[PDB]
Design a protein around this nucleic acid. Structure first.
Lengths: 224, 223
DNA sequence: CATTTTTATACTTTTTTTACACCCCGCCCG
DNA sequence: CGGGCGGGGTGTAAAAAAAGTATAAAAATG
């Protein structure tokens, strides 16, 4: 799931800035201090994206882009301290996909990185599991075995607030205040019926609950 | 061969300048002055690229981008007066491919257009369920071998549902993505058009197995 | 004229109400 | 003495009442 970004940069302050930006958005960072090393690692490590500093002293970055483009279609984001239009035009025409002029912020750089990366890429939803039960919170879909089981809105809110507090005990009042609302922080009769429903639908033995545990007198706690 | 570019711009001078500049470099140019017209023209003209000015007073550019992104992957280049980082981020994350602050040089704009075009240059991913085949990018729905005609709203609803396949969407978010932020009250609209979608697409509209109701919550497309 | 919005009514699900069984314990009762 | 007799807190199963949904059809929209 990790996006591999190769930075071609010799300056320590800029490399620090980039590393902060990239690690701040969940990407792995490869580094190269020279253009030649940059090409070598562009080949050997197959980055998903290359950030190139045109202010590299060891040679011409535009020729780096032209050399790279002879055998790779990897997205290239070019950085510069200059503002000259002809540089932008030349770099983009060489095969760069984006061009950032100083000053640039972390936010914009991250956004343009996401833009450049989303072209060569779904990511299934994270499930929560216990027994043979599967809960997809974002999708509001619950499975048990190979069959979907149907939860009503309150049943689902209950299940959710329980899942997000696994192992921890909740007072009937706070369960009520988080599922129903403030107006019924005393209606401690509902939860028995509804937890009864959850137990009925999800537990393998509703009589002896393994996941939906009642803390006698004080409230409830969920396990797994 | 010859690239089609759609410009969504309200200011006359900019429209004329851009038309001259782009036709000069060998592109065929279409223009829209409002966002809704812009969307309609995107849908019918199938442009290779869209240039969108966020300064349009008739609505929300970000909203245009999202709606368009429900079915099209066409490169969108955004022009703006504001140079604030937040608006850039918002537009780019909405689905724009590039962002220029006005005023800009025409040379840079043209280079960026060339980048966007040469990049996006394999067939459309089809969505198949029952006997229905959906091609969002070409805005064409087939049932069996016969084309099914969906109205603009019906297609928008369908596109949102298919884009969130397997997930239940709440009434509020369906309303917000289909009608706009000022219709998040009218759930009956949603019931009606889900009715239409079922009638046109389900084998048995009365007992659907692909367009599912999540009572008290919203709706969901399965498979 | 196609399409969307308003209007009206029959329908299904879900929440809530209402009823009564339980089970581990303690101590009032043969 | 030492077993039935109750009372918190709790679990199931029905009902009645709210809430939310499906569909047709007419009026408005542009």
């Amino acid at each position: 799931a990790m996006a591999n970004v190769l930075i071609v940069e010799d300056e320590q302050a800029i490399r620090r800035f980039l590393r902060t930006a990239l690690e701040g958005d969940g990407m792995r960072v490869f580094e190269a201090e020279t253009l030649q090393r940059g090409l070598l690692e562009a080949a050997t490590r197959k980055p998903d994206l290359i950030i190139l500093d045109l202010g590299l002293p060891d040679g011409d970055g535009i020729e780096f882009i032209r050399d790279l483009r002879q055998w790779s279609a990897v997205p290239v984001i070019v950085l510069s301290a200059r503002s000259e239009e002809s540089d932008k035009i030349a770099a983009l025409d060489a095969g760069a996909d984006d061009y950032l002029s100083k000053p640039f912020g972390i936010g914009e750089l991250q956004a343009r990185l996401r833009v450049a990366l989303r072209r060569h890429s779904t990511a299934p939803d994270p499930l929560v599991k216990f027994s043979d039960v599967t809960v997809d919170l974002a999708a509001r879909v619950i499975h048990r075995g190979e069959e979907e089981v149907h939860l009503t809105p309150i049943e689902f809110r209950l299940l959710a607030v329980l899942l997000n507090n696994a192992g921890k005990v909740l007072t009937q009042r706070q369960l009520l205040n988080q599922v129903w609302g403030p107006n019924a922080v005393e209606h401690s009769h509902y939860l028995r019926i509804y937890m009864g429903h959850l137990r009925q639908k999800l537990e393998q033995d509703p009589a002896r609950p393994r996941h939906f545990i009642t803390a006698t007198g004080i409230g409830y706690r969920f396990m797994l």
